[PDB]
Write a protein that binds this DNA or RNA. Structure first.
Ligand code: K
Ligand code: K
Ligand code: K
Ligand code: K
Ligand code: K
Lengths: 850, 850
DNA sequence: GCCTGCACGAAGTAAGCATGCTTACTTCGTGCAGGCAC
DNA sequence: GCCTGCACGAAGTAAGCATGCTTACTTCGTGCAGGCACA
């Protein structure tokens, strides 16, 4: 029934009892491990060393049990299986310790362990009821454990005297103890074998086990009474008790060492303490008592229920949290009156939801609990049944309204489903769970037969119906047939082109379904495009494939050049290999011309004119005038960093100083030509849009209405365009009718910055500081962005360090790695030894790689 | 900006115009492909064959353009770029076809293609304004296209007469025609070069391009007027027209063949039709109009909006669906009055939700749309801001209530969050999007600072907080610290044991967090258990690992035997390899003894006594009596199918007959021993529970309350137990307060049958028919279950054919495969040739394998 | 609750998977500056 | 006036991944028989 015990001793006594109980638990764990070694291998079974180790563990367990509660007052209200052992020990002549009188019973340690706050998940089991392999007489052993005779309890199998085992009758006759006829009949059988089970004794004597044992008191009849009568007349040997207490601990550790030695011999592996605890738990798990302890521990940890109330609930409901969650509050209070309503709500989520989220009374909620078990039960129950229960007076108004609102909300939470449509769906198909099942079964026509179920309702209910119906030519019947045939939009997409054609789908429909419109731009037919998508994934990766692999499979060189986006001036100049290599390494033809030299381009196989075309238009215009020379033009462009602006923004005297092989007479002409070019630059696109042009641009971007709204709010379309150019996001948003979508339509990058989690003011500041999100990515530093008032997460997301930061790296180190290695993929493929040299942890590098 | 034209002709005329326009599109695609081949490779550029092919394509394009609208009435309301070409051609003296007069202008084909319902995604471009490489005179070519002179338009470059090209003035002098001084000044320049651009003509003559060209009518001034005056006076050559119509199509296919021949030479790959369409799209993307067309087609395909209204919306909003979805119905009707409210709701999901799901008026919804763009805007807007707008009279009551209900629902959809708590959260943190962001940032204390936010609210909002706080010793501060440090419960779980210990977590806490309770039962410490979970996933897979791999990594043989659950009589008999093999193949030691023979067990390395122990206890008891012999005992057990019951249920005369080698004297004693054994069976277990025992069993199973309710409803606990034993699921469920959970608590297998989707009556019938779900799986047939009223899906789910049915196989064939090959894994590893012999398709076997 | 391994059966439970919101891997369409000219 | 080349960045698309939820995938509960062995 109930196991409980209260500790009334001091803190020192509490710690002493804790240590004693833990040592006894270790001893009994040694007992159990020795029994497991006995049963595991017959080779170890045929070994007296294992048996002597087992018996030594039993003796140490008995000693530590005798050492429990020496003052016989540290514990009170000791209850085992419902029996109050306090009063029972009070009604005895010799009295004694109720804690020890409980520990001599099986599972009685559950009462003492609760009084000492021992972690029940370690299973602190202490049992002293060994009979077969007990080196002592079983009843004498139990009586010594009860009376706490540490002096008489041996700690070594060799210290066991025969007067306590085989020749036990020697000890009785030594103290002149009166014996009745029943105890004489017990002794006449015990003389044959002192380890005879009490069941066999009661069978042969024609009595009950209770009659054979008797009360554990000298003033009774039975073997327990006889051994108590013998023990009480024995004086306490304080010296021997002190010696056993001093010796038993090191002896226990020595027994553990011997156990590990025997395990490493017969099994070639040791039995760890955690393995012993887990095996003890696996053994005890078969018992409803341990299931109750586990349920109470879960109620304490997860739901925060008090220990006593959690134990009461676990006892009353066989340790079934699922059953407690379907039990009404009135029954919970009947079984455990100390339970609080808040604890009942925490354990019963249905009750909690009904009370708090719906304002129901406890009884009104218990109504729904009794009638439908859970919220899932309410969602599965038919609305007609609920209405009938309400009409018949069997369901209260509050509970009925709550159930109807729940069933309706479960459907109205979807887009396009109103209250009327949800009620019609409930009338048509019983319950929202049935509606969900019909949607899973793709019963699209059956769902659309109900009034209110439109295209939006179908898209929100049936998964994949939106993706199918959004294709031209595919109607509702065709989408339903495809879904029911293949088993989901995923399977329809995984289907083959030939079978999709067998279903009657157009090649355009199959292309739109499989998303291979670009792959069919690269490759002629749909079959090979689908094969490429299956093999490599995306057309982007297909383009990223190397030149040799692309020439394999069956692509021409011109096809590969079109795939990799090789320009004409780079395709017709070199071969495909070197052209694609240069393109993949530098990105742009202008970057090629800036990095690689004219002589290098010539050495790679370029025409002296094609090499100049690969060189910048600045180089081309330089070579146009007289007295240039390719190397001198290269030197000039490296001095002005390939920039006609910086070339013209210089005096010819300064120009002749920077360059190594050039005179003033030529520098004058060079600066003149550069200034002529920059004069031809204002004659290009220097015009800033006029009023009508800004008006038309606004009407294009945000529409006629919002454009007129902006023009009326501010001065004119010119002022609106000025605000747009200066990225006045806040001043644009303050206009009624102008929102984030319109601002992002006007201000480029605002949408990306908002998706990154930035406030409009933060996006405005970042744009005013850097220009665009591209320049932010290829420039902004984490310290700069922190000085702009941004958080580290926003900084990582806007710079692209999202994956590296998710790999448990700070923004600073992620930015350093990305800056050293170039790309995030390059950091992920970076050398592990190089990362270790940088100073990253092993687990950090493992997370980076995975 | 607007392109439109309406077709009023009959079905035959519609098909004729469709074919003519498609052939003209093919001809212009050939033109563009020839130009692409000219510019792609200089080797192909230096080839007159490609130029001749290009000119033939141009001539065929001109012919097909002349062949459009022969009756001059098939089209009406022709509008191109805003100009009404119907009225423009009506105001001319010669009249003509407005469709043909529009196609001579750039992009005018967009008007004609809409009248023929041609898929605009193919870009049906037709342009007849070639100047440089035009084999004919450009203005004469355009005028022939204008007046539809298919007879005068040549179909072959060799058929081109010089009087239509170099010596074009010969054709003018053939018809005299009066000419004015401006056209004479144009002719004096055209004599120098007939292909002089109109820009150059207007530049040299000091006039405008419009003044040089003139109206395409004889009653005007310009080169167009002159050529029209010349052409009108030319009689129609019906014979040449009919011959050209008969000849041009096959000529076009021949030109396509020549184009593919030239492409396979200079590029080693052909130009597919889809590639040509994509290149046309890439060219036309610079004309921005295609952006509008794509938006209109998307509005047609997804939301089912009419073509004209979709085009109007895309024009008015620059083809931005995100912008149209944020535009109110009033503005949508102002820009496109033909739009319907249902189409506006379909395109604006916010408007649809406000109108239908919330019962708002169109104006009340346009209010919220103007003020907050979208439902996301409302969720991002502060409740204080909405209340202020309502108080100041700037927001209507209906719109205010709708916005408040939306903001509240977005939070109350979570468990534990009531209306009061949602309102308090809105007051505290502005908006539900801010609440969601705070929950993502693990601001657990900041959220709990609000009244009403309890443990359930925290568990429902913060993901993983429940999993963390449900562990003993872990408090709110520790859970918040762990979440904010690692970045989610997933990362906390992926964290290492050493760093979790560095955070101060107990080993028990780390075990409960990582779910390594079984792996730490197999292996001693936590580090190796976590490594095993990382490498293999689950202890189940660790057990499934082979013997060699298990001996690797560092497991002992006894450890492997404990892992694989090898019995003692099978572990001590053979070696680990053969023991684990036999166990994985047969399951139980009794199955080993029944299948394998005594001689086989001996051949595998078993002791003559260990082989008998591996054999059944029936075999052991048989060998107990005298004069048996192991082979004779095997024969007896094979005769009685290893069943002492069937052995005792026989006469010794019948016993001596079945086995081939046994006498009557021995059969008598065998039957005697078997009957003695079955007599020793009735004293073991047979007691049908008494009344008090049934009462206690009910109190254990369904609880005290429901047990007493059942005992009162029915006769007694005995009757309740009878109902349970006979699986009276319906008769138990009819009791108020008894539900599926209690029934499954009483009736084993009911929970599994219900999770399989079976109604309680179906589960009751299946249980009454078969006994248990185990026997259903190991016995029930699909035909039997269909006769029991079950569906094929339920049959598959209850028999375990779920994966095979998901592999697009019917239940009958899936059951046949599972019966023949045993297991689903065996069907997967089955021979592909054997499956083909069975008669499965290639794709079917592929789906089985994958 | 002798005691737990051996075996089976079933959902208890927790690993593996479907699902829906989120987020750029990938599309994919736009803007614009030079460069030869139709 | 096209054409090519590159930069830009939003979501059109389509995978990424968190977060919930199935079910037998993985664990847990029960009966029994003979050995660890007792009400
Ligand atoms: K080359
Ligand atoms: K606004
Ligand atoms: K806790
Ligand atoms: K062996
Ligand atoms: K009921």
């Amino acid at each position: 029934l109930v196991y409980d015990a209260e500790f009334v001793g001091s803190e020192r006594e509490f710690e002493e009892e804790r240590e004693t109980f833990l040592k006894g638990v270790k001893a009994y764990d040694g007992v159990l491990a020795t029994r497991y070694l006995m049963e595991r291998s017959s080779s170890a079974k045929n070994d007296e060393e294992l048996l002597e180790l087992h018996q030594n563990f039993i003796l140490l367990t008995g000693s530590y049990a005798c050492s429990i509660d020496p003052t016989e007052d540290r514990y009170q209200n000791v209850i085992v299986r419902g029996v109050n052992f306090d009063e029972r020990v009070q009604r005895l002549s010799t009295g004694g310790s109720p804690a020890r009188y409980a520990i001599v019973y099986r599972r009685g340690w559950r009462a003492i362990a609760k009084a000492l706050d021992i972690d029940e998940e370690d299973v602190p089991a202490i049992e002293v009821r060994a009979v077969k392999r007990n080196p002592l007489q079983p009843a004498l052993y139990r009586i010594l454990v009860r009376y706490g005779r540490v002096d008489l309890m041996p700690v070594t199998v060799d210290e066991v005297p025969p007067e306590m085992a085989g020749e036990f009758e020697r000890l009785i006759e030594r103290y002149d103890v009166p014996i009745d006829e029943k105890e004489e009949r017990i002794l006449e059988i015990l003389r044959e074998n002192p380890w005879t089970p009490h069941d066999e004794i009661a069978r042969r004597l024609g009595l009950s086990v209770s009659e054979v044992e008797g009360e554990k008191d000298p003033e009774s009849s039975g073997i327990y009474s006889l051994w108590s009568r013998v023990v009480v007349n024995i004086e306490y040997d304080e010296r021997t008790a002190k010696r056993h207490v001093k010796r038993r601990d090191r002896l226990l550790e020595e027994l553990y060492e011997h156990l590990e030695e025997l395990s490493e011999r017969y099994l070639r592996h040791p039995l760890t303490r955690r393995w012993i605890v887990e095996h003890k738990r696996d053994i005890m798990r078969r018992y409803l008592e341990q299931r109750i302890v586990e349920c109470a521990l879960k109620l304490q940890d997860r739901y925060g229920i008090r220990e006593d109330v959690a134990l009461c609930l676990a006892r009353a409901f066989d340790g079934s949290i699922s059953m407690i969650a379907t039990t009404p509050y009135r029954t919970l209070k009947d079984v455990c009156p100390d339970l609080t309503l808040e604890e009942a709500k925490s354990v019963n989520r249905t009750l909690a939801t009904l009370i708090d989220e719906h304002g129901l009374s406890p009884d009104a909620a218990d109504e729904l609990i009794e009638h439908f078990e859970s919220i899932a039960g309410i969602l599965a129950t038919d609305l007609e049944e609920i209405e009938r229960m309400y009409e018949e007076g069997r369901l209260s108004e509050e509970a009925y309204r709550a159930a109807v609102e729940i069933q309706l909300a479960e459907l109205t939470k979807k887009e396009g489903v109103g209250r009327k449509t949800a009620e019609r769906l409930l009338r048509a198909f019983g319950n929202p769970e049935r509606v969900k099942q019909l949607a899973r079964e793709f019963e699209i026509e059956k769902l659309a037969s109900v009034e209110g179920v439109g295209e939006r309702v179908l898209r929100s209910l049936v998964p994949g119906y939106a993706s199918l119906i959004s294709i031209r030519g595919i109607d509702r019947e065709r989408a339903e047939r495809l879904l029911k045939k293949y088993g989901g939009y995923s399977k329809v997409r995984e289907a083959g082109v030939e079978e999709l054609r067998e279903d009657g789908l157009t090649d355009a429909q199959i292309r739109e379904l499989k998303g291979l419109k670009t792959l069919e731009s690269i490759v002629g037919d749909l079959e090979k495009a689908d094969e490429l998508k299956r093999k490599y994934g995306s057309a982007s990766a297909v383009r990223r494939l190397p030149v040799e692999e692309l020439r394999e499979l069956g692509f021409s060189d011109d096809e590969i050049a079109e795939i990799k986006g090789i320009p004409k001036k780079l395709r017709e100049a070199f071969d495909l290999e070197t052209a694609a290599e240069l393109y993949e390494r530098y990105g742009s033809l202008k970057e090629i011309g800036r990095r690689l030299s004219y002589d290098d381009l010539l050495e790679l196989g370029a025409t002296p004119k094609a090499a100049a075309e690969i060189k910048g238009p600045e180089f081309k215009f330089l070579l146009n005038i007289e007295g240039v020379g390719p190397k001198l033009a290269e030197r000039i462009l490296e001095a002005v960093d390939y920039d006609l602006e910086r070339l013209a923004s210089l005096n010819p005297e300064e120009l002749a100083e920077k360059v190594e092989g050039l005179g003033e007479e030529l520098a004058e002409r060079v600066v003149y030509a550069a200034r002529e070019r920059v004069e031809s630059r204002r004659k290009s696109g220097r015009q800033e849009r006029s009023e009508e042009e800004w008006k038309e641009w606004l009407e294009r971007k945000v529409g006629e209405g919002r454009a007129r709204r902006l023009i009326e709010y501010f001065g004119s379309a010119g002022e609106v365009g000025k605000l747009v150019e200066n990225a006045e996001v806040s001043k644009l948003l303050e206009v009624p009718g102008i929102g984030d979508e319109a601002v992002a339509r006007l201000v480029p990058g605002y949408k990306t910055l908002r998706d990154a989690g930035l406030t409009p003011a933060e996006a405005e500041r970042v744009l005013k500081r850097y220009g665009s999100v591209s320049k932010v990515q290829e420039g902004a530093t984490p310290d700069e962005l922190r000085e702009l008032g941004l958080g580290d997460a926003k900084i990582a997301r806007i710079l692209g360090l999202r994956s590296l930061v998710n790999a448990r790296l700070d923004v600073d180190t992620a930015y350093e790695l990305a800056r050293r290695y170039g790309s995030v993929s390059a950091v992920r493929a970076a050398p592990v030894a190089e990362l270790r040299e940088l100073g990253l942890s092993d687990r950090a590098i493992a997370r980076i790689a995975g």
